[PDB]
Design a protein around this ligand. Structure first.
Ligand SMILES: *[C@@H]1O[C@H](CO[C@@H]2O[C@@H](C)[C@@H](O)[C@@H](O)[C@@H]2O)[C@@H](O[C@@H]2O[C@H](CO)[C@@H](O[C@@H]3O[C@H](CO[C@H]4O[C@H](CO)[C@@H](O)[C@H](O)[C@@H]4O)[C@@H](O)[C@H](O[C@H]4O[C@H](CO)[C@@H](O)[C@H](O)[C@@H]4O)[C@@H]3O)[C@H](O)[C@H]2NC(C)=O)[C@H](O)[C@H]1NC(C)=O
Ligand SMILES: CCCCCCCC(=O)N[C@@H](CO[C@H]1O[C@H](CO)[C@H](O)[C@H](O)[C@H]1O)[C@H](O)[C@H](O)CCCC(=O)Nc1ccc(CCCCC)cc1
Ligand SMILES: CCCCCCCCCCCCCCCC(=O)O
Ligand SMILES: *[C@@H]1O[C@H](CO)[C@@H](O)[C@H](O)[C@H]1NC(C)=O
Ligand SMILES: *[C@@H]1O[C@H](CO)[C@@H](O)[C@H](O)[C@H]1NC(C)=O
Lengths: 266, 98
């Protein structure tokens, strides 16, 4: 189940300053970047164009170039109209794309000042329950733009899953890459033993403190942290009594290891 | 509005005298404007690379900074973050194990 996410972040500091930057993810791998400074969408993989021809890509890109300017103008005009009741600074975030299932669903969510306020769903834009009531009229007005509604419906319902199926084909060797974890043990000089596991890909992993074959259910798994080389970092900690560290080991199972687990004895 | 959380950890097992990569992962902040430095013995490290800023399902922003480093037992390393949510910059020292 791959989720394709286009993430747009727009900061409007005052009437004279704003920027919009985007990043695009297929699962946990970045496929695109679109800096405010750049006219064109940048590829972060050799396969970021999917199976689209250069001409098909330039058309899609062109649509987004027009959108980015229109969106920026629209927000600036809206703030002028609402002044002084709604005023700068303003953060708007969009999360849009599609989740690919075997044998898809799409989404477009919008947040204002860090809170989810608006989505596109079905054939229209809608404010979500609890969103500020001042958004209702601008959304009603946007909903009167049939051409925009038809374009968004196409992008979500059709363009997204098609583009993504091409990405999955074109990027298969990267998407299915296996990178092996390296592990190491530590503690501060009752103790907390820490098993560090770094450099694994893909994300699914099993890390457990063991005494022989017995899993120590006291094992607390940390958050998955990214390394800068598209691999993952995780630590698992165990609180133990002093003198009771002998016989403990950290065991790591991962798809890349071919059934040969890492076992590190304290 | 939301205060950044800072985690500092190495790419490879930290072994004294061996080149490695130190990561500073900054998360759970809003607004997105932020200043991130990595420090060696309290002084700013020049070549620090940054990921593109992105955001999570909950809309909070995150970003990864990293730099080459060679741990020794005469050097400290840290990550220092300035953000509007905090009166003063927040510094988290590498705990020497992570
Ligand atoms: C794109 O796909 C849309 C559906 O997919 C969802 O939204 C997109 C954006 C993605 O996020 C995707 O992942 C989502 O799952 C699709 O939207 C659908 O459009 C049709 C019409 O084009 C709508 O049908 C009309 O439904 C209303 C009733 O709606 C309510 O009840 C239903 C359940 O019964 C709920 O699901 C809704 O949420 C509402 O609560 C009918 O009143 C209406 O009947 C009238 O119109 C028809 C002609 O259309 C006449 O024949 C009749 O006589 C009536 O006068 C329609 O049947 C459907 O509601 C809507 N789905 C949703 C969830 O809103 C969109 O059309 C796609 N566009 C393209 C270009 O592919
Ligand atoms: C991922 C979003 C993709 C949106 C694609 C929109 C397509 C587009 O560019 N629409 C603009 C162009 O409109 C004209 O040209 C079209 C042909 O290209 C059609 O013919 C159309 O009929 C015609 O009018 C149009 O200007 C849109 O208004 C762009 C901005 C749309 C938008 O996203 N507005 C928006 C969204 C959310 C919100 C609320 C959140 C912010 C809360 C403060 C407010 C406004
Ligand atoms: C927004 C829904 C996209 C669905 C269609 C897939 C189109 C491929 C998009 C390539 C990356 C574009 C990234 C910039 C988008 C943005 O402004 O957020
Ligand atoms: C607008 O915001 C930018 C970015 O914060 C700032 O540098 C600039 O001084 C502001 N301009 C005005 C006219 O207030
Ligand atoms: C962002 O890009 C737009 C379009 O080129 C430009 O007008 C604007 O000044 C840029 N903003 C910043 C802060 O650089």
């Amino acid at each position: 189940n791959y989720t394709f996410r286009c993430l747009q972040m727009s900061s409007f500091a005052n009437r004279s300053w704003s920027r919009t930057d985007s990043v695009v993810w297929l699962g946990d791998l970045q496929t695109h970047r679109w800096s405010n400074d750049s006219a064109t969408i940048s590829f972060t993989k050799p396969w970021s164009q999917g199976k689209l021809s250069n001409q098909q890509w330039e058309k899609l890109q062109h649509m987004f170039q027009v959108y980015r300017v229109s969106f920026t103008r629209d927000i600036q005009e809206l703030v002028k109209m609402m002044s002084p009741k709604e005023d700068y600074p303003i953060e708007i975030q969009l999360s849009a794309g599609c989740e690919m299932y075997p044998g898809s669903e799409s989404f477009l969510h919008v947040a204002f000042q860090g809170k989810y306020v608006v989505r596109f769903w079905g054939t229209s834009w809608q404010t979500v329950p609890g969103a500020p009531s001042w958004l209702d009229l601008p959304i009603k007005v946007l909903n009167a733009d049939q051409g925009t509604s038809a374009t968004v419906q196409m992008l979500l319902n059709d363009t997204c899953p098609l583009f993504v199926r091409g990405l999955l084909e074109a990027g298969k060797s990267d998407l299915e890459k296996q990178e092996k974890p390296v592990a190491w043990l530590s503690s501060v000089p009752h103790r907390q033993l820490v098993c560090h596991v770094s450099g694994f890909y893909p994300k699914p992993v099993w890390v457990m403190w063991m005494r022989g074959d017995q899993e120590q259910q006291g094992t607390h798994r940390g958050d998955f942290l990214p390394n800068a080389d598209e691999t993952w970092y995780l630590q698992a900690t165990l609180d133990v009594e002093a003198g009771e560290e002998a016989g403990l080991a950290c065991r790591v199972k991962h798809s890349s290891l071919g059934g040969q687990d890492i076992i590190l004895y304290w | 509005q939301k205060t950044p959380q800072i985690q500092v950890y190495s790419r490879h097992p930290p072994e004294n005298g061996k080149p490695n990569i130190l990561n500073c992962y900054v998360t759970q902040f809003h607004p997105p404007h932020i200043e991130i430095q990595m420090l060696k013995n309290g002084k700013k490290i020049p070549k620090v690379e940054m990921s593109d800023m992105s955001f999570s399902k909950d809309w909070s922003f995150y970003i990864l900074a990293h730099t080459e480093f060679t741990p020794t037992e005469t050097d400290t390393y840290a990550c220092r973050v300035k953000h509007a949510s905090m009166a003063e910059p927040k510094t988290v020292y590498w705990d020497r194990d992570m």
